[PDB]
Design an enzyme around this catalytic site. Structure first.
Site, PDB file in Angstrom:
ATOM      1  N   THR B   1     -13.083  31.510  63.550  1.00  0.00           N
ATOM      2  CA  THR B   1     -14.358  32.196  63.704  1.00  0.00           C
ATOM      3  C   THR B   1     -15.491  31.197  63.855  1.00  0.00           C
ATOM      4  OG1 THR B   1     -13.612  34.079  62.375  1.00  0.00           O
ATOM      5  CG2 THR B   1     -15.977  33.811  62.701  1.00  0.00           C
ATOM      6  N   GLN B   2     -16.144  31.228  65.014  1.00  0.00           N
ATOM      7  CA  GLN B   2     -17.254  30.323  65.267  1.00  0.00           C
ATOM      8  C   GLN B   2     -18.516  30.781  64.560  1.00  0.00           C
ATOM      9  OE1 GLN B   2     -15.216  27.763  66.492  1.00  0.00           O
ATOM     10  NE2 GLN B   2     -17.156  27.312  67.494  1.00  0.00           N
ATOM     11  N   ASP B  59     -13.015  39.104  59.207  1.00  0.00           N
ATOM     12  CA  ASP B  59     -11.894  38.257  58.824  1.00  0.00           C
ATOM     13  C   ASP B  59     -11.275  38.712  57.514  1.00  0.00           C
ATOM     14  OD1 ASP B  59     -11.991  36.574  61.031  1.00  0.00           O
ATOM     15  OD2 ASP B  59     -13.503  35.286  60.107  1.00  0.00           O
ATOM     16  N   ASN B 104     -10.432  26.454  64.057  1.00  0.00           N
ATOM     17  CA  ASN B 104     -10.721  27.869  64.274  1.00  0.00           C
ATOM     18  C   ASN B 104     -10.647  28.589  62.936  1.00  0.00           C
ATOM     19  OD1 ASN B 104     -11.217  30.326  65.432  1.00  0.00           O
ATOM     20  ND2 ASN B 104      -9.276  30.456  66.537  1.00  0.00           N
ATOM     21  N   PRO B 105     -11.607  28.352  62.057  1.00  0.00           N
ATOM     22  CA  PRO B 105     -11.443  28.735  60.651  1.00  0.00           C
ATOM     23  C   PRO B 105     -11.635  30.228  60.421  1.00  0.00           C
ATOM     24  CG  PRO B 105     -13.619  27.894  60.992  1.00  0.00           C
ATOM     25  CD  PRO B 105     -12.932  27.756  62.307  1.00  0.00           C
TER      26      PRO B 105
END
Lengths: 250, 215, 239, 228, 201, 213, 238, 204, 240
Positions: B1-2, B59, B104-105
């Site tokens: 998540t950007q 998320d 891409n956390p």
């Protein structure tokens, strides 16, 4: 799945291998092509097989294929397998020309194709090609050249060779009438009509039953000329005029 | 998540004598806007472990989906084995670290409470893969505001009863309502014991505004 | 992708496809090679000319480098692709370690190429044997051969092809120390050896000598006519 | 008629693993003896022709400075397993900065020995002996085409295997010395080979705890022959 | 960081300092910057200390495999060419490496210089490092091909001493090797503070 | 945007002895200006003869420890013996280099005994270069601890001072004093001092309190 | 017989013979016996050799601190599953940081070995794993087979001449759930003396014992430390 | 820019039963000539030419890939290529490198082989063909060449006056450009013969 | 012969024998019956005690696919739990994609197509298992499906697979399952598997029962011990 496999690649217990010898047995029948050279020029004389009275007689030739701008080939055997090999070495000569910007030497075009043909005899579990074929051409390193390929994949340079149905009858007569480096391209044309007079069982040499193409060197042209059906029959009767004189005077 | 679109806020948690209590509010913000005002940010994992989260909420529904499957497929084996709370804490730590390594956390910060085999468990999980254990935890601005109120009780008194802990959480939820622009006066309290996991309803605070008459 | 085990064991421990390939070698033409102390000499026999073909396209002595020649027997189709893979390897050695390729190194490349190829899936083994002859650095002339199973193996004199047992039995009664005395005297051993084989009366033999500093040098059929005269002339007077 | 390469017997073993055990009864014989002073290890060459160069062939080859080998059966596919053993000892030295022990070399090769099939094609027809000195003293191992390895004390491998193994059980004891274990093996090779024993039919190699892998040559070898 | 190497009549002399820093902080004073590839080859450490340590340990793996297959030792020209090709595959990715390869060979002494950019050159004298330009000035004055052994020891030892005196990132102790016929021999290891009292009076 | 690194502080210290090795570290985990916990040591027991310390980014310190503990088991199942201390240091140099282009932000010091019962200290960079030393200090306060041990252990910059080797008793109070000086001036140095002592008989532990700012 | 060549082909009776022939491979290996108490799990093996100077082939392997196995069959396939076995124990310990349960390990083995028993040109794994371990539910004795059909049991025996060992265990299994480790082992040692010819039994060089225990990590005993266990047995009655 | 790295100019013009094509001769790198005999017009069979201008790599690269595809066409088929067909062949070749494009702009000129009718077209660097009836230009000095041809072109021109117009169009437009010059070669084709002339230009 | 080796060849009268040979392997497994009541499904498996050495609770022929779906198998046990893995894996992808619990008319459709896919090729063999699926939903009621090794599925009010298949479903239609709740069923499931497998062929055997419905709140689980002891109290009253 291993019960249906035919194993077209393994040896035989006597040492040889069966699958290309059956293909070289099929190359015996079905066609007749021959070549000759001794001087400026080289010719391919091929015998047409389908002589039925309902055909269009187009595509500029039947068994003669122009490969490069200065070489051509005559083919024999399975005609469907022939069309795939022809447009395979036709772009080998172009990717050479793309890479070096120079026309390809005639010998190392033959070695490139005969490595592709050899690989099917060696792995892949695949039917080999039942095609043997001649090669005429010109290059600046050795001039006029003449080659022969085999379905096994080995080639050779020659001066006169036939792969007809009675090819062994023709080769035994080619090495009875020849001269190394003195047969110009009129005596070679006269000798070509004499040989296929013998190996063709259909007598009298109908001018539509044969095909003749020559490769003569013009300064920057290397003219590959398939000679038309108006000058064949005068060359036929020219053989026929002398043979009545040579028989009666002996 | 950007970029986190719809986010949550601080989550509290503290041990007591035989169980862990966790509280968080019921608001999903969007920038400075309070769009979603009735969401729930606490998941009840099977019987002895329990999860709350901050950060990006979309998320969180992903991890609510994945952990939901990892408990269902285990219990229909009939093994007589379940995941301990620190086994889930070990799993969730590897899930964070293996995903920041691909750059891409998961924009989250999670608190895992649990009570298995007579003892309490309380674990922290960061977005970057930073994890530890503590007798009291707080995320977000709660690490600045509520976390000093937690430690000064626990250093003067190491063990707490259940009623002392539940009182001490409601004081810290009141503080976050005054001094945080992303809070909301509607929260819920979840508690594990030996009896199981219990999630209380939409509780509210009692505010004092007597200093507003001071010119 | 044709995945099938071609070469498998027999119930008594042989590899049938390997020893069937050794009979394809046993009817190729004869190739003989000896080494002198200063000049090596190898030469095929049974050229089998038909006087209508180009004599250079039928050659079986080729060069892998300046220092390494190669002869073979068996079927010629599989031969000239082993050669073209060996030319690449001996060239890529020069991009690595700067000295030219030793003659022992290139036979380990050929034999290891030939072995693992009797091990893969869907590949019949090669049907050729080879003679690799070279005078390496520090001027040590030596030769090797290659079984189709892939066992590289050095020699002082050898002969493969059709009629190889009779020629090897001829050399053991004939390879003395003084037979390699002179450079023109070692050649008289080879021409006497191939004459004791399939006939080749000066018209079917093609020797190729190498004097440890030149490249390969094929003598034309005039000195072979000169050598076969004097090789029979010594036999003319002693008996 | 044709089975696969991967088929069990009704008696239950396999076919081509059992066939490869028959293939190593055609190779040259080889004898290795483990002695607490060190490992001696010998072989014959089976010279075929007088014109053959004798030193071009070899059966003893080294894997590292402290590990030797000896091969039998087929030879051409033995060179694949030797090269895998050499690379394996260098990867162990690269990452752990020490010497790989003699046993853990052998199972690295034995895991490779049974990997044929019809994916990703036949078992290896060799048989190996591994002589080495690791930190547990001198060792001696023997693998199989089947991938089975076991520590031996005095193993004889080749076409004359069971004839030598009978004559080797009667001369060995646990308190040998290396100077007489060398002499004891050449008596056994003298009985079983075809030609007369000289300094060219055979070769030896020993490994000691002190020095590294040493292979004899045609000058220090024939003193044991003349003093047999 | 300052290394140098020069070859003469009696083999090759290799010398280096031992200070490894981190920004302005000095990490250690005892870093051995001349690592020992073989009993017959030597390699230096210049630039990235971990990159020179890895790829020259990986070269020592590769040279050992060459010796087992071919039954003689590798040449100095072949050894640097292997190192030049491995590093080139990571060109542009940011490797720091400026090592040198020393050793006796069948053609005599060998002294090549390998960069991380792909430079591979021969030569007689070299000096690599941050204080390398301080080493060239004193080394060019006292260099001769026909130096004695004890004279060539004093040249390379004092040349490192002048480089550590000017450069801030160079210092520690002065390691000194000598490549000979049979192999390299470690000569000495002197501290700079001991050389300061020696070279003053 | 998303930065993948953060600095969590921490300070480790190892001293190689004649028949021992002492590894110590603080127990404070903290990033930014806040405090996460006051109990999080860095003494990790690998074997009975090897202790590793890991300081830096804490998410990498958790991962790198679990990678190592797997590979010590894979060695024993494949070689029937435990790793020595020098074999661990050669192994971990390859692990750190394996992520050369996305490195671990971890400073590592391995202390333990060799095969002869002597102390050994291996200090690492985050890429994987190393050497063997007598004493190293890594982490945040490494600039403060290293000059003090050059004076006392190394006997550097002193005149007419005899050279006695460090006993176990002198090395204990030398470690305990040097963290008290480091806790005053460093904001990262924590509250409890976990000291792990590796001898020929096992690993002893000891916890010493500090100030708690 | 044409129905007896490949694993794919069914018999007209419905019995794939290539699976049944792999059962013959486990009947060729030497015997081994596993059994359990309330709190312990003991497996005892019987080594073989080729000559009197070659060493004995070991059979008991260490998988994890609470799992050990015993093999019967061809050893190269045993190491192919043992390396799979070690790998599946330590990655679960890498992820969840807990010992992997024994009953959940064997279900991975049954799925692993069932795949080559249904493809084309793939042999079955000829191996005879007896598995002893600890869940949180105490000891477990499991056996597998090349037919990928694993069995929960409390005492089994597999290998050559194993039927005589099973007859000893059936008439003594009322006592197994009470006794401590001392006569639990020499109950199992009385099973291995049943499966031998009548002259040699237990000469301290062909036997190996493994125990996992309620406070005891899994431990393999070999040929010197066997001697405390092996003493105290009566002579073979005849 | 990228097109101004080597310079260049190609012009084609349509006549009565004839068509002429012209180009410059300079090869250079941004300020500095190298040689004055750089070929930019390539033959594609009889009575059909192509001119290339732009980056000097892609002038020599596209003229070899196009010759590669042309000889395979004229051997698979038994005839020479029409002028309209080659325009579709080149536009395929450039559009395949849609995101890796060749930095050139071709100009095609030739006569139709059966009915001897002229044909001119031009393409951009990703292959948008544009057929005209009077003239096409390509190169760096394009705007100078439009002022020539808009004022000098006539509809029906014999090959004598066609040569004089395209010569005066090139000698004045290229003279006003800085990175183009050093000689002009002019091909003028027709159904009976073909004519190549080189003009006396400023070598300045 | 030769027409019955591969599964890719028809017979000269048009049937595949490799499927029919694999069906014959089902009639060596013992007996697994399952009937559905008014408001639930009750499975039942009689289990052979092969030897005394095995443990009570070993090698269960009665699986648990989803939270509400059950499976009882009869065949070659290695192939049975291989099908139980993909069916358990298929129900997970339904919930992860579509959000809710998978229905049975879709679940038995997805598994049977996976079974059918191994009766087309020479590279694989057909499975040697037949099995049953049963569940209960509050919006759908009870379901009961059965899958043969060929890949054919149907619904049933009660079915049976094993050795004595016809001898078991003879007595099933004597019952009245349309009205009985799943409490009286549990005594009647156990009774009809006591009259089968006489004590001549087998020495001793083991009852194993399963149970699903809203009395189990939709979850699938085993019966309690006390209820199946009532059915084993209801054992020796079939001798009259």
């Amino acid at each position: 799945s291993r019960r249906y496999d035919s194993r077209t690649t393994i040896f035989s217990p006597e040492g040889r291998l069966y699958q290309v010898e059956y293909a070289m047995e099929a190359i015996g029948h079905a066609g007749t092509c021959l070549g000759i050279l001794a001087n400026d020029g080289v010719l391919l004389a091929a015998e047409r097989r389908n002589i039925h009275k309902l055909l269009d007689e187009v595509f500029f030739s039947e068994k003669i294929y122009k490969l490069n701008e200065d070489m051509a080939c005559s083919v024999a055997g399975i005609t469907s397998d022939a069309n795939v090999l022809t447009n395979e070495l036709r772009l080998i000569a172009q990717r050479y020309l793309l890479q070096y910007q120079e026309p390809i030497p005639c010998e190392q075009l033959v070695t490139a194709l005969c490595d592709i043909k050899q690989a099917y005899t060696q792995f892949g579990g695949k039917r080999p090609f039942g095609v043997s074929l001649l090669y005429i051409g010109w290059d600046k390193h050795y001039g006029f050249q003449l080659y022969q390929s085999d379905p096994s994949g080995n080639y050779g340079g020659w001066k006169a060779t036939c792969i007809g149905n009675n090819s062994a009858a023709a080769v035994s007569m080619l090495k009875q009438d020849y001269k190394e480096g003195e047969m110009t391209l009129k005596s070679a044309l006269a000798l070509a009509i004499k040989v296929l007079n013998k190996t063709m069982d259909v007598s009298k040499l109908s001018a539509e039953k044969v095909e003749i193409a020559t490769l003569t060197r013009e300064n920057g042209k290397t003219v590959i000329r398939v000679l038309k059906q108006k000058e064949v029959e005068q060359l036929i009767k020219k053989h026929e005029e002398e043979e009545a004189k040579a028989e009666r005077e002996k | 998540t950007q970029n986190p679109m719809v986010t949550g806020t601080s989550v509290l948690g503290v041990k007591f004598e035989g169980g862990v209590v966790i509280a968080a509010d019921m608001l999903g913000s969007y920038g400075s806007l309070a769009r979603f005002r009735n969401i729930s940010r606490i998941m009840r994992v099977n019987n002895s472990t329990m999860l709350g989260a901050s950060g990006d909420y979309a998320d969180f529904q992903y991890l609510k989906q994945v952990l939901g499957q990892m408990v269902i497929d285990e219990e229909l084996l009939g093994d007589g084995h379940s995941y301990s709370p620190r086994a889930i804490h070990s799993w969730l730590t590897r899930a964070m670290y293996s995903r920041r390594s691909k750059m891409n956390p998961l924009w989250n910060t999670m608190v895992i409470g649990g009570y298995a085999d007579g003892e309490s468990f309380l674990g922290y999980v960061d977005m970057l893969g930073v994890a530890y254990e503590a007798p009291s935890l707080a995320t977000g601005y709660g690490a600045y505001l509520a976390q000093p109120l937690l430690r000064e009780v626990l250093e003067k008194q190491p063990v707490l009863s259940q009623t002392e802990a539940r009182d001490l959480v409601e004081r810290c939820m009141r503080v976050l309502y005054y001094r945080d622009a992303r809070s909301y006066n509607r929260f819920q309290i979840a508690t594990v014991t030996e009896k199981g996991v219990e999630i209380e309803g939409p509780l509210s605070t009692e505010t004092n505004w007597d200093i507003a008459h001071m010119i | 992708s044709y995945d099938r085990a071609i070469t498998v064991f027999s119930p008594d421990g042989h590899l049938f496809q390997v020893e069937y390939a050794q009979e394809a070698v046993k009817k190729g033409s004869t190739a003989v090679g000896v080494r002198g102390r200063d000049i090596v000499v190898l030469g095929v026999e049974k050229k089998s000319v038909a006087k209508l073909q180009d004599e250079r396209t039928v050659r079986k002595i080729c060069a892998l480098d300046d220092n390494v020649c190669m002869a073979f027997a068996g079927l010629t189709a599989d031969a000239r692709i082993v050669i073209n893979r060996a030319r690449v390897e001996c060239q890529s050695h020069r991009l690595t370690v700067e000295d030219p390729v030793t003659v022992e190194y290139i036979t380990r490349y050929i034999a290891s190429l030939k072995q693992r190829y009797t091990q893969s899936n869907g590949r019949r083994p090669f049907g050729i044997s080879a003679l690799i002859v070279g005078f390496d650095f520090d001027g040590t002339p030596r030769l090797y051969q290659t079984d189709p199973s892939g066992t590289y193996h050095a020699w002082k004199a050898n002969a493969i092809g059709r009629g190889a047992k009779s020629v090897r039995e001829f050399l053991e009664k004939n390879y003395t120390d003084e037979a390699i005395e002179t450079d023109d005297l070692t050649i008289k051993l080879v021409i006497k050896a191939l004459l004791e084989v399939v006939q080749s009366g000066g018209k079917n033999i093609e020797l190729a000598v190498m004097r440890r500093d030149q490249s390969l040098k094929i003598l034309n059929p005039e000195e072979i006519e000169k050598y076969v005269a004097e090789i029979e002339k010594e036999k003319e007077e002693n008996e | 008629y044709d089975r696969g390469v991967n088929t069990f017997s009704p008696e239950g073993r396999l076919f081509q693993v059992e066939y490869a055990i028959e293939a190593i009864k055609l190779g040259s014989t080889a004898i290795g003896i483990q002695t607490s002073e060190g490992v001696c290890l010998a072989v014959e060459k089976r010279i075929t022709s007088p014109l053959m160069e004798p030193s071009s062939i070899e059966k003893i080859v080294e894997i590292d400075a402290h590990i030797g080998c000896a091969m039998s059966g087929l030879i051409a596919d033995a060179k694949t397993l030797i090269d895998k053993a050499r690379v394996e000892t260098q990867n162990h030295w690269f990452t752990y900065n020490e010497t790989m022990t003699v046993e853990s070399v052998t199972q690295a090769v034995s895991n490779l020995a049974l990997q044929f099939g019809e994916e990703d094609s036949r078992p290896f027809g060799v048989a190996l002996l591994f002589g080495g000195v690791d930190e547990k003293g001198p060792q001696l191992f023997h693998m199989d085409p089947s991938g089975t390895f076991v520590q031996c004390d005095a193993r004889a491998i080749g076409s004359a295997s069971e004839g030598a193994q009978s004559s080797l059980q009667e001369v060995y004891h646990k308190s040998m010395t290396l100077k007489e274990a060398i002499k004891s093996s050449l008596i056994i090779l003298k009985q079983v080979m075809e030609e007369k024993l000289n300094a060219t039919n055979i070769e030896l190699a020993t490994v000691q705890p002190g020095q590294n892998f040493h292979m004899f040559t045609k000058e220090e070898l024939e003193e044991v022959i003349k003093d047999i | 960081t300052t290394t140098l190497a020069f070859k003469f009549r009696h083999g090759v002399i290799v010398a280096a300092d031992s200070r490894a820093t981190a920004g302005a902080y000095i990490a250690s004073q005892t870093v051995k910057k001349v690592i020992e590839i073989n009993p017959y080859l030597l390699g230096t450490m210049a630039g990235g200390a971990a990159d020179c340590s890895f790829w020259e340990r990986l070269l020592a793996r590769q040279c050992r495999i060459y010796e087992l297959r071919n039954k003689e030792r590798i040449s100095v020209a072949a050894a640097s060419k292997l190192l030049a090709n491995m590093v080139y595959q990571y060109k542009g990715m940011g490797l720091s490496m400026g090592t040198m390869i020393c050793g006796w060979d069948k053609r005599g002494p060998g002294l090549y210089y390998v960069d991380s950019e792909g430079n591979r050159i021969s030569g007689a004298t070299f000096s690599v490092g941050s204080g390398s330009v301080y080493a060239y000035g004193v080394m060019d004055r006292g260099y001769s091909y026909d130096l004695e052994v004890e004279q060539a020891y004093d040249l390379a030892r004092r040349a490192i001493y002048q480089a550590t005196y000017r450069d801030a990132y160079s210092g520690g102790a002065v390691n000194l090797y000598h490549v000979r016929e049979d192999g390299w021999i470690r000569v000495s290891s002197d501290n700079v503070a001991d050389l300061h009292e020696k070279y003053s009076g | 945007r998303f930065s993948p690194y953060v600095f969590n502080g921490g300070t480790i210290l190892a001293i190689a002895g004649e028949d021992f090795a002492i590894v110590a570290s603080d127990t404070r985990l903290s990033e930014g200006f806040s405090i996460h916990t006051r109990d999080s040591p860095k003494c990790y027991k690998l074997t009975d003869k090897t202790v590793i310390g890991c300081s830096g980014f804490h998410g990498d310190c958790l991962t790198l420890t679990k990678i190592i503990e797997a590979r010590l088991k894979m060695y024993k199942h494949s070689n029937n013996k435990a790793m020595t201390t020098g074999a661990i240091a050669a192994m971990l140099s390859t692990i750190l280099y394996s992520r050369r282009f996305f490195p671990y932000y971890v400073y590592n010091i391995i202390g333990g005994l060799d095969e002869e019962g002597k102390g050994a200290v291996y200090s690492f960079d985050p890429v994987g270069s190393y050497q063997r030393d007598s004493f190293k200090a890594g982490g945040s306060a490494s600039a403060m601890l290293q000059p003090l041990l050059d004076n006392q252990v190394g006997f550097k910059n002193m005149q007419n001072v005899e050279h006695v080797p460090l006993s176990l008793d002198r090395a204990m109070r030398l470690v305990k004093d040097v963290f008290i000086s480091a806790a005053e001036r460093d904001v990262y140095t924590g509250d409890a001092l976990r000291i792990c002592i590796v001898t020929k008989e096992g690993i002893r532990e000891e916890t010493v309190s500090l100030r708690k700012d | 017989n044409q129905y007896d060549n490949d694993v794919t082909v069914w018999s007209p009776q419905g019995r794939i013979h290539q699976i049944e022939y792999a059962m013959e491979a486990v009947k060729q290996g030497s015997a081994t016996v596993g059994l359990k108490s309330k709190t312990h799990a003991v497996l005892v093996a019987l080594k073989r050799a080729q000559s009197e100077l070659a060493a004995h082939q070991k059979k008991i392997l260490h998988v994890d601190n609470h799992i050990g196995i015993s093999i019967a069959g061809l050893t190269a396939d045993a190491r192919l599953l043992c390396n799979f076995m070690r790998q599946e124990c330590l990655d679960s310990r890498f992820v969840f940081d807990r010992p992997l349960p024994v009953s959940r390990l064997v279900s991975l083995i049954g799925s692993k070995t069932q795949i080559p028993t249904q493809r084309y040109g793939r042999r079955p794994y000829g191996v005879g794993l007896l598995i002893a371990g600890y869940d949180d539910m105490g000891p477990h004795i499991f056996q597998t087979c090349p037919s990928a059909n694993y069995f929960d049991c409390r005492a089994m025996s597999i290998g050559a001449r194993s039927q005589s060992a099973r007859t000893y265990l059936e008439r003594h299994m009322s006592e197994f759930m009470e006794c401590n480790l001392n006569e639990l082992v020499k109950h199992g040692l009385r099973a291995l003396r049943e499966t031998l010819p009548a002259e040699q039994d237990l000469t301290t060089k062909n036997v190996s014992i493994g125990i996992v225990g309620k406070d005891l990590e899994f431990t393999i005993y070999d040929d010197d430390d066997v001697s405390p266990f092996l003493e105290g047995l009566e002579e073979r009655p005849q | 820019s990228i097109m101004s790295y080597n310079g260049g100019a190609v012009m084609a013009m349509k006549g009565k039963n004839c068509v002429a094509i012209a180009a410059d001769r300079r090869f250079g790198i941004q300020a500095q000539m190298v040689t004055t005999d750089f070929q930019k017009i390539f033959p594609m069979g009889d009575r059909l030419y192509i001119g290339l201008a732009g980056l000097a790599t892609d002038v020599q690269t596209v003229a070899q890939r196009l010759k590669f595809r042309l000889n395979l066409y004229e051997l698979k088929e038994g005839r020479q290529i029409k002028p309209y067909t080659l325009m579709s062949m080149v536009a395929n070749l450039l559009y395949e490198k849609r995101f890796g494009p060749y930095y050139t702009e071709p100009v095609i000129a030739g006569l139709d082989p059966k009915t001897f009718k002229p044909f001119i077209c031009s393409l951009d660097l990703i292959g948008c063909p544009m057929v005209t009836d009077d003239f096409v230009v390509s190169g760096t000095c394009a705007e100078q060449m439009y002022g020539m041809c808009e004022s000098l072109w006539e509809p029906n021109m014999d090959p004598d006056h066609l040569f004089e117009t395209i010569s005066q169009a090139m000698l004045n437009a290229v003279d006003r450009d800085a990175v183009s010059g050093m000689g002009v070669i002019v091909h003028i084709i027709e159904k009976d013969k073909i004519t190549t002339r080189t003009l006396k230009a400023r070598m300045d | 012969t030769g027409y019955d080796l591969s599964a890719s060849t028809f017979s000269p009268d048009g049937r595949v024998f490799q499927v029919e040979y694999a069906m014959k392997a089902v009639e060596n497994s013992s007996t697994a019956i399952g009937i559905r009541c008014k408001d639930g499904v009750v499975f039942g498996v009689e289990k052979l005690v092969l030897s005394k050495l095995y443990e009570e609770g070993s090698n269960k022929r009665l699986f648990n696919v989803d939270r509400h779906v059950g499976m009882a198998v009869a065949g070659l046990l290695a192939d049975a739990r291989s099908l139980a893995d993909i069916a358990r894996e298929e129900a997970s992808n339904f919930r992860s994609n579509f959000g809710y619990n998978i229905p049975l008319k879709h679940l038995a459709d997805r598994v049977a197509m996976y079974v059918h896919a191994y009766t087309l090729y020479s590279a694989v063999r057909p499975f040697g298992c037949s099995f049953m699926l049963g569940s209960y939903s509050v919006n759908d009621g009870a379901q009961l499906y059965m899958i043969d090794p060929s890949g054919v599925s149907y619904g049933y009010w009660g079915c049976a697979i094993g050795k004595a298949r016809q001898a078991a479903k003879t007595e099933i239609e004597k019952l009245q399952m349309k009205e009985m709740t799943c409490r009286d069923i549990v005594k009647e499931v156990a009774k009809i598997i006591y009259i089968v497998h006489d004590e001549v062929k087998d020495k001793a055997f083991e009852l194993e029962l399963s149970w699903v419905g809203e009395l189990t709140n939709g979850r699938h689980e085993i019966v309690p011990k006390d209820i199946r002891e009532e059915a084993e109290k209801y054992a020796k009253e079939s001798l009259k």
